[PDB]
Amino acid sequence: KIATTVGEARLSGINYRHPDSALVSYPVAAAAPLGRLPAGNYRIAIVGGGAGGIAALYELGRLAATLPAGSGIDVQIYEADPDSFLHDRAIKVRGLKAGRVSAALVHNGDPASGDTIYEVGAMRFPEIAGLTWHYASAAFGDAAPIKVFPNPGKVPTEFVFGNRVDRYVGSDPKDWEDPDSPTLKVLGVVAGGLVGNPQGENVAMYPIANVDPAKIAAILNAATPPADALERIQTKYWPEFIAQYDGLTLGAAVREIVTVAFEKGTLPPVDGVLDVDESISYYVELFGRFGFGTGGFKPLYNISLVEMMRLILWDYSNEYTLPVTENVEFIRNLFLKAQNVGAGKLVVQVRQERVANACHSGTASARAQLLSYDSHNAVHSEAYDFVILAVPHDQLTPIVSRSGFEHAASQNLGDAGLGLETHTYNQVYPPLLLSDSSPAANARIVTAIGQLHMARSSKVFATVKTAALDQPWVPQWRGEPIKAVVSDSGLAASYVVPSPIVAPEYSSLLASYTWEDDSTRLRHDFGLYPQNPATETGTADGMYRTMVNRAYRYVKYAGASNAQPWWFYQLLAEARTADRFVFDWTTNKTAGGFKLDMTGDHHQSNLCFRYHTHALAASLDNRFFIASDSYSHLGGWLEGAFMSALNAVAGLIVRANRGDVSALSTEARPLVIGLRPVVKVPAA
Amino acid sequence: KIATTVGEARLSGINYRHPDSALVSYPVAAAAPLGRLPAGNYRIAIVGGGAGGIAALYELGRLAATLPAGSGIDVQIYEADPDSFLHDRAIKVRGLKAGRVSAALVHNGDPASGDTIYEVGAMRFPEIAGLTWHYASAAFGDAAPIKVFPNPGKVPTEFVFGNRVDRYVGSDPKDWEDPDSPTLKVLGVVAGGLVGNPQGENVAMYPIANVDPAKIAAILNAATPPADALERIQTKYWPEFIAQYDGLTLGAAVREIVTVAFEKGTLPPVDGVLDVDESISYYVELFGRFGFGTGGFKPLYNISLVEMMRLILWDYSNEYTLPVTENVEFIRNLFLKAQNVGAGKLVVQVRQERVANACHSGTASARAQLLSYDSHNAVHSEAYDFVILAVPHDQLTPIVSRSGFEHAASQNLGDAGLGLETHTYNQVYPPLLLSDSSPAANARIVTAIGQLHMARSSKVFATVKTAALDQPWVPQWRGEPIKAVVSDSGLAASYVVPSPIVAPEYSSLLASYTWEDDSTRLRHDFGLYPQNPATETGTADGMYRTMVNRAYRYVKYAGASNAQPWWFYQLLAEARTADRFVFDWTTNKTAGGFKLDMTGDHHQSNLCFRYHTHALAASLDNRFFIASDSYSHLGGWLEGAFMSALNAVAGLIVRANRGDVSALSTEARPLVIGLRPVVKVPAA
Numbered sequence A, B: 001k002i003a004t005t006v007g008e009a010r011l012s013g014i015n016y017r018h019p020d021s022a023l024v025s026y027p028v029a030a031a032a033p034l035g036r037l038p039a040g041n042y043r044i045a046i047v048g049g050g051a052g053g054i055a056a057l058y059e060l061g062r063l064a065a066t067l068p069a070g071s072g073i074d075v076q077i078y079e080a081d082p083d084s085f086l087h088d089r090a091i092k093v094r095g096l097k098a099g100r101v102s103a104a105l106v107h108n109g110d111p112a113s114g115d116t117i118y119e120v121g122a123m124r125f126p127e128i129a130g131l132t133w134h135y136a137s138a139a140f141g142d143a144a145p146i147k148v149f150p151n152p153g154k155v156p157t158e159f160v161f162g163n164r165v166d167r168y169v170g171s172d173p174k175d176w177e178d179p180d181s182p183t184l185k186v187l188g189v190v191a192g193g194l195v196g197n198p199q200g201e202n203v204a205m206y207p208i209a210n211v212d213p214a215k216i217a218a219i220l221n222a223a224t225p226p227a228d229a230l231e232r233i234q235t236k237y238w239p240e241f242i243a244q245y246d247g248l249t250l251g252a253a254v255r256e257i258v259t260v261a262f263e264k265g266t267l268p269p270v271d272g273v274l275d276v277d278e279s280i281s282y283y284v285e286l287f288g289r290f291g292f293g294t295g296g297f298k299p300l301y302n303i304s305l306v307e308m309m310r311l312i313l314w315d316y317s318n319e320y321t322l323p324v325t326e327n328v329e330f331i332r333n334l335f336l337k338a339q340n341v342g343a344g345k346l347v348v349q350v351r352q353e354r355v356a357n358a359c360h361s362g363t364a365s366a367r368a369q370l371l372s373y374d375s376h377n378a379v380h381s382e383a384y385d386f387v388i389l390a391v392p393h394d395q396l397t398p399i400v401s402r403s404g405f406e407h408a409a410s411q412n413l414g415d416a417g418l419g420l421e422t423h424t425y426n427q428v429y430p431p432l433l434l435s436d437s438s439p440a441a442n443a444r445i446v447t448a449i450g451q452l453h454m455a456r457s458s459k460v461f462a463t464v465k466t467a468a469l470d471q472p473w474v475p476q477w478r479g480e481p482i483k484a485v486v487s488d489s490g491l492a493a494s495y496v497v498p499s500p501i502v503a504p505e506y507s508s509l510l511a512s513y514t515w516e517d518d519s520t521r522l523r524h525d526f527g528l529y530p531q532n533p534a535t536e537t538g539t540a541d542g543m544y545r546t547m548v549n550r551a552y553r554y555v556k557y558a559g560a561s562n563a564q565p566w567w568f569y570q571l572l573a574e575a576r577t578a579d580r581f582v583f584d585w586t587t588n589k590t591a592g593g594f595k596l597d598m599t600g601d602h603h604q605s606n607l608c609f610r611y612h613t614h615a616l617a618a619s620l621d622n623r624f625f626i627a628s629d630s631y632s633h634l635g636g637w638l639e640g641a642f643m644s645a646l647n648a649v650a651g652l653i654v655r656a657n658r659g660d661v662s663a664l665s666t667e668a669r670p671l672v673i674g675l676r677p678v679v680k681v682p683a684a
């Protein structure tokens, strides 16, 4: 059944537990305030006003409301992005960003009467993203309507790889133009081999607990599993999967699966003519371009099988939209709701400042220091009781890695190489303080953060009349125009998304949404970085013409006598001249789009995911928590940012209670105690 | 033992055979002209004037000299780069490029009296790069002097990873500041595990033919290996290594090796605080930052083990300089020698034009078509007998991939999406024509090329007085200043290279040479793309200050209780203000620096490497060959470009002789017959 409201989606994934946190359903943990704080007047900083920082603010507001008369929380939120919604009370971006939730409003002079929205970052939300939908309910209510995201396969789709063309909806051969397609056949082989069957015989190549992944997904998503089953997944079976397969790439796993299927005769020689290795390779690459429901994962073939398996267990591709004009509205509404729930006990101030350094210093009550620069490069220093560092890993690195790894009598911190003013701190310890006695422990967390993999990504947009889809040369599936195109043209994945400002006259032509090497191949043509146009009134016309030129390819369709230039070239050219656009996340200060783990990376990302458990070590007294999708096992999803925020606040509560986990609610306790601790000594 | 001349290097590597072409020493094959051509007047195009194209030209000259009176070869060389040396017959680059062999001349107004050279691309040449040194002899003579390239470890070096600092020269612990260093221990573990022993017991973890790679390297390099050894490596043992390990990344292999050593007790818990998996991870990441002799291979951890193994067998890190002021002189000299060796039978014309399309068309004997655009964007169409496509894979894609995969009655080819004029070709076949009957076969080569991995890379340079190294603040080790710095600061690898224009007053401060994610992390700070400054008179001061600022880190050393800002900060800041520079290969039209194969990519790269064997099918009228390091098993080396050129010309000979391999010399025949063919034709 298709979910139709926020509440329907919310309930669908409410119990789902991810395999690295299999003892807890984050939505259940988040149902009530996470815990209790001692009486006091707290001074907290949140660095970053994206999904992570704003979810953390919301949870702090819920905590604040439980404080007794005379107590409260003050939060300073640092947000360097001048386009953040936090600083706002033709293509417009000002006020339309919340980090990587980022809209561009296409208008003709009056932004209150726009044509369309480009969703530059986050855009499609898994049904089983339970924490995402929990917060969407807080922001919009359960009754608010949602739509199926128009992914390849969800709407009529054209797929092109090499000489192969397909036109399809879903996976039922009755809905494919060629029901005998090799593409659909290889999908079945690769899906059988990776996911397997929820009932009956185990057919998957890479079992978890000796069974198909499908069977484990059903346990992870149960209300009342075995408890014993979740513990065994958490402590035994998922760790054993990691031990076996964290060194195996997705691309290698696809090839293994295809090889066995080819040997068995489930897949035929390609064309009847290619030799064994050529046939296997063709199928591997065909599947690579086709994907799992959101376009080709070829560019993602270097991720570990472990990372892919997380997405498989989550049924990640089954996605919806939010009940918004622009996705940034979600984060803005959560910010406003934070302030409302705090019931007067939370006070929030926004600083348009870039944090340059964090440390612990001095001997005062508040020892968590932040050094920042304002928009005219003036320096500021402030000390806090606790700090949540809600920025992704490459943005976190300069803040946490330049103070060394142990006690220092004095340091002059700041951006001295930029010629900016430094600040002297005394009796200095690193911010990410895992040990009082081991510089290597402090170095492990810093070095791990700095070597996480930020996947590269870019989006090319234009504005097109929706009626362009009705041109005679746009193909149809049962009378509905093709609205998604997945191709090896260099464009990778393309979408003709109806404007949300409304049938709408205009659509957002997401001409190219690329990852990893697909993005690298395009980057030389972008012209201006990270955004072309850099101005509200420019147009990235030259850039966009290079994308139309990539689509200028002769494509042969079955039964046709000759190839003609691809119809998609014609569609791209139908976009208006004004408002052509590219955003390159790679050349944004994030240094890419979102974390995806390579082989071996589990050790690094999982350390970050578990970092908040430092709060168990009472005498350590570390005041810094981290909150981003970079510090999760769902990089590239709001779910990851939100999970990491929940971890950070849970840890903060434990720390504020000097290591006492009974200060967490019963439901929230496993956020801390269901993970391996990052401090072995001291115990707690 | 250290080679001191071109000739000594040339003779050292003359016999070396790479494992994917184990039957043949390319230098031995290149000792005489590669074969014979029928009498005639050939019209050949070479697309690209880099190492691949120019070596191909040289080999065509050698062939041309053998043709009878009235015969000859006319070559049109297409070169789109306005800075190519081919079009030239403060920071100056004009005339100082040969593709990715690329110099920047720093001068103060008179380019004939410069200060230093930045080697922006190629810079360090393995001793056993036999074909490289063969051509270097052609260009410079055997007597010309060479120097050891000042790699980390070849000169006094500082290494920084997390809390770990090492100062060292070589691999003898006597010359490490800390002979008990964990870095030295992990290096020894990873060498034992990957390379093993040339004599006695086999200790490596990934054997070839059941023995350590060191033993296979000695066979591959032998003047006269045992009977059948090379054939068994080529057909059995190297294919078996690929089948086992091409799905294993380098990073995964390092972790496997470290894990076993940790379990055995060879590597201890890092300190008393880190758990087992944290210690293992620390060692894997420590080794990752240290490397194999040319700086950390952490950014290269996603390469297949097979790709690393190629470099191990080749002793890749043992490298030298060329006998030049600028490396481009090598390619320029080879171009001039090509014309000389042609003995008036080779005529060469240079076209300052960008090729947009290749195809076969029409009914004339010259059926190989190239469509190009000149500097006024005017279209040109020219037909040839044969074409050598000497450009790397992302530059080749638009040329070969937009004509479909079978016959077409007509096509209007060119850059129509750019608004440029097209040309109508009739009776069209794709250029990379593997089959007259299988679109999938034709698709395999195209799709393979387009999905090869171009490693990302960037270089940040500045000019510093060499005497800066003599300041008390620059550490000395074993009698000389530190001149190589390998670090996790974001800079990755840094070198203070004496100017070749001369002890020289100035040095090229290669402040940062990055690969892969290390480059991605920096890219947002480059300011202008692909080069800052974009003009001869500017300086990339703002960009460079962001690099200096990455060096502004408190570094604890054993020799002082109070950590100070890293000395390297001071050194970077000692560079002069003028002539600060970055070049980003990623945003160059190459879409990166050079091919490195991911897991699974052997299937694609090896297809490209073997492509020239199409010439064996006489009934197939394919006139196009490919010549670049992208189509080799040595992406990122001149050796790969040169091997691919040799393949291309060998294939061209066989095609010009209508499939007759006896037209190759005895020693060159294996360039074609020693590989698995890409077409199936009768034995013998």
Ligand SMILES: Cc1cc2nc3c(=O)[nH]c(=O)nc-3n(C[C@H](O)[C@H](O)[C@H](O)COP(=O)(O)OP(=O)(O)OC[C@H]3O[C@@H](n4cnc5c(N)ncnc54)[C@H](O)[C@@H]3O)c2cc1C
Binding pocket: A047, A048, A049, A050, A051, A052, A053, A078, A079, A080, A081, A084, A098, A099, A100, A101, A120, A121, A122, A123, A124, A125, A353, A354, A355, A356, A390, A391, A392, A395, A457, A458, A585, A590, A592, A593, A594, A627, A628, A629, A630, A635, A636, A637, A638, A639, A640, A641
């Ligand atoms: C191309 C792309 C596609 C995506 N698609 C989806 C999708 O379809 N579905 C989905 O669920 N998610 C998607 N995501 C992921 C989603 O956008 C992220 O998971 C989430 O927005 C990240 O939130 P965060 O708080 O971790 O970090 P960010 O969003 O990066 O926010 C960090 C904030 O900190 C600020 N900041 C950084 N450094 C400093 C500093 N030094 N001082 C002060 N302020 C600072 C930034 O300006 C920013 O506002 C996508 C993202 C991208 C880029």
Ligand SMILES: Cc1cc2nc3c(=O)[nH]c(=O)nc-3n(C[C@H](O)[C@H](O)[C@H](O)COP(=O)(O)OP(=O)(O)OC[C@H]3O[C@@H](n4cnc5c(N)ncnc54)[C@H](O)[C@@H]3O)c2cc1C
Binding pocket: B047, B048, B049, B050, B051, B052, B053, B078, B079, B080, B081, B084, B098, B099, B100, B101, B120, B121, B122, B123, B124, B125, B353, B354, B355, B356, B390, B391, B392, B395, B457, B458, B585, B590, B592, B593, B594, B627, B628, B629, B630, B635, B636, B637, B638, B639, B640, B641
């Ligand atoms: C950062 C870096 C570091 C390196 N380090 C080393 C090293 O230390 N040692 C080593 O041996 N090698 C090194 N290399 C590798 C070496 O530079 C390459 O292997 C070699 O130069 C590649 O030659 P090529 O002919 O394959 O391609 P290229 O050098 O890319 O030459 C292709 C030529 O074709 C032209 N061209 C492209 N497209 C078109 C078109 N459509 N029409 C017309 N002209 C066109 C280009 O302008 C260019 O001149 C390095 C390279 C880089 C970038």
Ligand SMILES: N[C@@H](Cc1ccccc1)C(=O)O
Binding pocket: A124, A294, A594, A635, A636, A637
């Ligand atoms: N959620 C994003 C980013 C992402 C891509 C692939 C894997 C994981 C995350 C998308 O669906 O495009």
Ligand SMILES: N[C@@H](Cc1ccccc1)C(=O)O
Binding pocket: B124, B294, B594, B635, B636, B637
């Ligand atoms: N030859 C180049 C590029 C390269 C790097 C790493 C591996 C292979 C090639 C260098 O030594 O920097």
